[PDB]
């Protein structure tokens, strides 16, 4: 090793004495031993792209070869870190050097070598035992919440030599050794992993259950999988932390990943300061989220070779926790901020542009993004599977899905919440649009809603027509004057209002619309349907009768049936339990038909 | 044969973007092919893109991440890339790059075939004249499809292009007055669920002991999907011109095809055309779009079908435009029809098939094809002119023939268009369908029938 | 092996999930008493039961000797997973050597094992076994307990497979208290 | 310390451009700093850009003329740009390059501190709270700054954005509730009335004891443009987390920055980027707008105020769209507004903050200030429509309430807005001049101020 610098050009270090150096190797330059990647090899000189800032390197300073590419580190130590595109630990680096500065070539390790872990190996393993790669071995108590499950690495196998017994090791200890061929393998609890290559399953299975989110828009109109891939417009006064704080707090995840790929300053110290306050309810207690939780957490000023890995470390991490048997969603905040760092990497390197400046490489590397997401079935023996489901977040300028990041990503993702200012500024809360939102992964919930919830997808495509029927219903009611309305159209224009009012609507600081499940989204959907079902056919029966029904009759024979429909959606799913909202709600609904009948 | 050891040079001089450069090389040939084994025992391929005295410019399919000027050992193996065929080729699985991935042995080589293939002589081709019935009144009424054409299906992202391609496939046979397709399909790019979606489908609406599959995903490497497309073909003209076969090749998403060649162009500084694809990019394209026909002597053909996605809905650009110069014809897959629940979504104003003159007429399909086809196209346009007139002009400011025209485009676009997904219509039932739409308006707006047509098939 | 399960990667995981089932096996049944699922496997028992090295089954693996589908040995290793899961679930307690064979060969003729309501309930048996490892003596962490050994005792006794109202009674009851705040 | 004997070389190699290519340097480190001496006795000043070898290539600051290869020297210092920084920089004027062009000694360092500085750890910056006042009520009362926001100005040319910068400057504080504060001010690209308008200015004004004032001209060297903004930032990060003040820092036309930047780049022999700018031009206005904010632990701020000119008054150009990006909010200087004869121009429709709601409020400014500035908003917007009707309706024909929406444009415009050059108004001024305005209208029309507080403020 130990090559030496020849010359420096700006972030371009040239060295010499560099023979057997890998392509995309990392190195470490200088005194202070800056990261660096090598990009160009030539005879023996190695042409190497600095990270931070080369002021003040000199000719014949030392080049340390590391000898792998951009790995992350895996073990136990992840859950509550924060990380960066590199995975330094900022939350490490702020207590051991005591000042508010990212130093300049700061080496520490992303995993305390500190900490003393509660290690119990598998109990049915000894010594001769035939272990592939994938087998969990041994069991970490990582907190209160999340098992860490030690793995062999996916490429190793052979017989255990050794095994170490339970008790308390940190992160260097040999706690297995196996043998294959005549030659051993020592392995710790820590792994490491490039973030540029896929990690290997078994098969990759087809995606068909849900993703709970909590809110009754996104969970009844536009339904996500585990599994899935989802894409929000990421803009100023849109209400987009509903999305992350749901995913966190209301999910059926077990493991989150957060990441910030460029984010400005100020707008990085408000996750910073939220996610460490979120909590949730297991088992009756209260604990925080930062016990499953992960940030990957950039700003404008940090190297721009961080600012393009930072999406590529978020899914390692997500890849490592789905192997485990897991069920993983990862988050990239402004994917658009990480298309310019790519732009800009290229740039650097004099390379010809593609639309918009853009580099010729910038779809595939968008596809192979979100094709790392899925439902699989793990690697290695014990027999389990787990899933990953990516969001990640677009900013279009002023709104327009033209630029070559938008196009890509929305000919990539199969759903689409769109969030609106419009509505945000109408105190419309959640702020989906529910017209230019979709979601194609409808016909994958198929089995599982006709095995669990019988009766909604109707009540889904009636709730969709009467939406879009009270939006194409508007030229009508202006161009003309409100009174050319057939009763039917009435109808509509009134209980197309009230879904909006009652069901779309959904307000988070209250203690009964935090978190909406869905069999009282199921129960809300139909005794509204319901309704609008038999409102509709007593006027179209007695159509031409002398006793013509009109929205008059209607909105009088019943004034309290009304009110305790726009009052189902304070039933809380807490004080009260799920037998007596499904009692209420059937009790709702037989007095519907009772005053319906007492009308005809 | 070649029965001299082949020689191993560890003398790699410098690695740069996908191009390793090698020195010391005794009389390098230009498009060998070479196996490079890296420091860590993993092995990759590629192919000598320049030759210069000792020096040879290798070019991995693979990438050239990991490697080294010192121990990374490449072997040359002293012959341009050939591919193994055989028959038992069907009813297989390979990935991008001619390896099994269903769990069978490699192929045992019948021949062993040139990857680039070889221009057929003009003289010794036959014009394509038998129509391919697809049931599909979009296609066969108004851009039919002869055995033999090379016709593309141009898309965008998020239509049901795969669909009907698949309806095109399990329906697909010739026309009857008074045995099968053999399938060969590559994907170059796709995702989890498009391989799934048709793997599933060929299993299940007909058999699979005659499809050949080539899938590279788009987790797989980039530079392999330059050769991927050229196994399919190869494979393809051994089951046609020498098993004498009826193949039918459907390549999917040449625009990742483009792409991978864009970037492979752009990584050595090569002159750029439109929006930065390379100026050979036509070239190119024809090397794969015109190996699909029919020769003299031998009773096989090859039809083929790629499938674009046009970047943006945009028609002018280069993926599209460069295409449509080179194939027989176009299918336009609409957006605009999609958003209106209209399966299958065909705008047939921006179709063409440039083989159908031929193919229909008297004693081919029947007497009126081309006459109603005409009529057809002349009344869609009109109404569609119409249509953008009311905009303006408002709904009370037609005439009664705007009216009639107006009539016409809701009629033909929910009957005649609007099929279903496994529906089969004979020709004969699309030919009666567009004549239950013209007798809309009096026969003396139809304009572009004879008189003699006029009095033996509009009263009726 | 479609997309990344080589020649060397499929037979290692081949020989890996053989050693699995060997091991699965000797835990279910130190004892043999089982002669009759200890027969079923018998083709993936013979490769363990005599000494071969980790080689040695490879090689069988790349020739064909010993099975080498690794679909069909993961639908039979997923059986014996959850037999010792529910086996291993009522720890205290016990289930007779007729019982043990009626399960597991209501569990081989399944559908798929994963979208089963034995996996489901063995789920849920095992939230509730899990929460009082290392819970801290209280009343609801008490309730939990006597509700938790009477349902493992209803479950030694009738079986998972079968529907026993008993059984789902005591379940949705045990995971209504699990879940109910501490205060 | 550095210890050792410094080494001059008589090596001169080269001289091209700006560059004076030397040769046989002994360890040559990059970005050093050279002294040269002329043949005939004149010192210059240069900075190493490129290391190869034995081989260095100086940049010198002031040019290369009357330069040869015979008897010119070079002294190389050992190592980089350090600048010398204290507290006693408080009221003075240094250039470009930092040395005192206001008839005084040289700084008496406190410290030395290299002038490129490290990235604040994201971790540590905390969240923007209390209000920066600048005395004018277009920004204080409607687009107010928080303590540690970045906020842009955007102008054009000769729009008066110089006056309104020097207002801010003269006038900016910290909210007098019922003061640790400075300002550091950089001018780069400023021709000579520009510079002698800010020296004159603030050194009369009697303010100039909490203002550090950096000059740099339009015909100074071009490099010194480039180290301008980094010399004020570490004089502001000295201040503001060592000492503990306030610091507000203005940077007047970073435009002008930017063609420093693309000039000093393609004397690298780099193709230029988009537009003529390189292509990393995000990342050097990132290192510059983000050595910002609070931090934990320390009792300081560092607001910005970055100033810029939209050429052609396009607001898509990379010098505005880039620093959209990176910063929050902006104000926007008219010319509609500026031609009416309007001083200052500042229209507020388009312009916004983005950390408004944190800045005022309760305790920080007065509890009616985000409701005020509501109203204000919405009455102006509807007055300007009802301006836009009254033209093609007549004035003889509008409603009662349409001439309310009438008379409130012609009073904010001329009593809000329109301010005066030196006339200082502190928060409650602006809201109390808020709420002369908006008792224009019934007590019922004022929709967005919720009744508890029409209650209070209202009947005055």
Known sequence: TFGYVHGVSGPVVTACDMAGAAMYELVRVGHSELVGEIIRLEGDMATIQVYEETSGVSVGDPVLRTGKPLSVELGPGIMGAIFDGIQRPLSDISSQTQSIYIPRGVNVSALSRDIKWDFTPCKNLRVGSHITGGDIYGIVSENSLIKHKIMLPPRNRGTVTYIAPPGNYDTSDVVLELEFEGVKEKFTMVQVWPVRQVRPVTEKLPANHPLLTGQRVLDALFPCVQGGTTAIPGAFGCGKTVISQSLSKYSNSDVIIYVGCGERGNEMSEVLRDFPELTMEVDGKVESIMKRTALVANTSNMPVAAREASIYTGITLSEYFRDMGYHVSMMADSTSRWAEALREISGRLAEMPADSGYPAYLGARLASFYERAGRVKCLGNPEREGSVSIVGAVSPPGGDFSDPVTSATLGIVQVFWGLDKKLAQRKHFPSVNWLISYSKYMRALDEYYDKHFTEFVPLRTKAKEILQEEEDLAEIVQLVGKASLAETDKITLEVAKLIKDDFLQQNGYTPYDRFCPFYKTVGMLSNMIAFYDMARRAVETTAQSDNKITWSIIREHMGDILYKLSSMKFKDPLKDGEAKIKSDYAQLLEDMQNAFRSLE | ?460 | KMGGLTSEQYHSQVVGKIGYIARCMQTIDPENNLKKIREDYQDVLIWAEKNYRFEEILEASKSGKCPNDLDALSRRSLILQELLRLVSSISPFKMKLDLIESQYEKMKQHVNLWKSDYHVKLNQLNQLTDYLKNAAPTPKNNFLRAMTSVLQMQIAQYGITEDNEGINQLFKLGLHLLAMANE
């Open chain 2, 1 to 460: 044969y070649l029965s001299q050891p082949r020689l191993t040079y560890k003398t790699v001089s410098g690695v740069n973007g996908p191009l390793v450069i090698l020195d010391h090389v005794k009389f390098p040939r230009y498009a060998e092919i070479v196996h490079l084994t890296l420091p860590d025992g993993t092995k990759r391929s590629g192919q000598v893109l320049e030759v210069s005295g000792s020096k040879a410019v290798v070019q991995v399919f693979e990438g050239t991440s990991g490697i080294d000027a010192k121990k990374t050992s490449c072997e040359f193996t002293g012959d341009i890339l050939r591919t193994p065929v055989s028959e038992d080729m069907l009813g297989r699985v390979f990935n991008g790059s001619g390896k099994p991935i269903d769990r069978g042995p490699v192929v045992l080589a019948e021949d062993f075939l040139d990857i680039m293939g070889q221009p057929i002589n003009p003289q010794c081709r036959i014009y394509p004249e038998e129509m391919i019935q697809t049931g599909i009144s979009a296609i066969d009424g108004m851009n039919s499809i002869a055995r033999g054409q090379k016709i593309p299906i141009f898309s965008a992202a998020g239509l049901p292009h795969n669909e009907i391609a698949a309806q095109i496939c399990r329906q697909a046979g010739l026309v009857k007055k008074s045995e099968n397709f053999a399938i060969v399909f590559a994907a170059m790019g796709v995702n989890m669920e498009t391989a799934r979606f048709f793997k599933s489908d060929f299993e299940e609406n007909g058999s699979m002991d005659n499809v050949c599959l080539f899938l590279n995903l788009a987790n797989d490497p980039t530079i392999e999907r330059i050769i991927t497309p050229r196994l399919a073909l190869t494979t393809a003209e051994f089951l046609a011109y020498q098993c004498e076969k009826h193949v039918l090749v459907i390549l999917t998403d040449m625009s990742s095809y483009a792409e991978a060649l864009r970037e492979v162009s752009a990584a050595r500084e090569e002159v750029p055309g439109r929006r930065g694809f390379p100026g050979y990019m036509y070239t190119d394209l024809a090397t794969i779009y015109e190996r699909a026909g029919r020769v003299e002597g031998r009773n096989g053909s090859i039809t083929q079908i790629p499938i674009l996605t046009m970047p943006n809905d945009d028609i002018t650009h280069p993926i599209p435009d460069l295409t449509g110069y080179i194939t027989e014809g176009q299918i336009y897959v609409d957006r605009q029809l999609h958003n209106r629940q209209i399966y299958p979504p065909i705008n047939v104003l921006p179709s063409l098939s440039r083989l159908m003159k031929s193919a229909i007429g008297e004693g081919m399909t029947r007497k009126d094809h081309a006459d109603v086809s005409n009529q057809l196209y002349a009344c869609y346009a009109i109404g569609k002119d119409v249509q953008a007139m009311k905009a303006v002009v408002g709904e009370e400011a037609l005439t009664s023939d705007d009216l009639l025209y107006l009539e016409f485009l809701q009629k033909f676009e929910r009957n005649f268009i609007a099929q279903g997904p496994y529906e089969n219509r004979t020709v004969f039932e699309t030919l009666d369908i567009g004549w239950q739409l013209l007798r809309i308006f009096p026969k003396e707006m139809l304009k572009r029938i004879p008189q003699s047509t006029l009095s033996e098939f509009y009263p009726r």
